[PDB]
Amino acid sequence: TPPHTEPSQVVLITNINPEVPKEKLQALLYALASSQGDILDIVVDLSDDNSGKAYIVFATQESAQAFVEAFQGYPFQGNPLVITFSETPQSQVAED
């Protein structure tokens, strides 16, 4: 029963241990990502101390949802791994 809530070629991940640098962390996010769908660009926050999050951009919602559901409940970098979609607006260009 696919609800279909707008397109999303990007996914937002959280609850990630900032103990690991984006250099290594990102490298891992890509390995797993590729295992499911193709990656167009993997973004990562500044590895805060209370935030610790990132965003993995895939080819399309098809691949994203595949990886999100494929790892929706899998122990990564510890155990508590959360994976969800995100928003991809385009008004910044519409206005000008």
DSSP one-letter code for 17: -
Buried b (16+ CB within 10 A) or exposed e, 57-75: bbeebebbbebbeebeeee
Superfamily of domain 1-96: RRM (RNA recognition motif) domain (3.30.70.330)
Element (H, E) at 50: none
Ramachandran sector of residue 15 (left: φ over 0; alpha: ψ -120 to 50; beta: rest): left
Beta-strand runs (E) in 45-87: 54-58, 82-85
Residue count of the chain: 96
- In sequence order, the 6+-apart residues with CB closer than 8 A to the CB of 83 are 11, 13, 67, 68, 71, 72
* Solved using: NMR
Written as six digits, the tokens of 52 are: 């610790």
CA distance 65 to 43: 17
| Three-class SS state of 93 | helix
Element (H, E) at 14: strand 10-14
Written as six digits, the tokens of 1 are: 């029963």
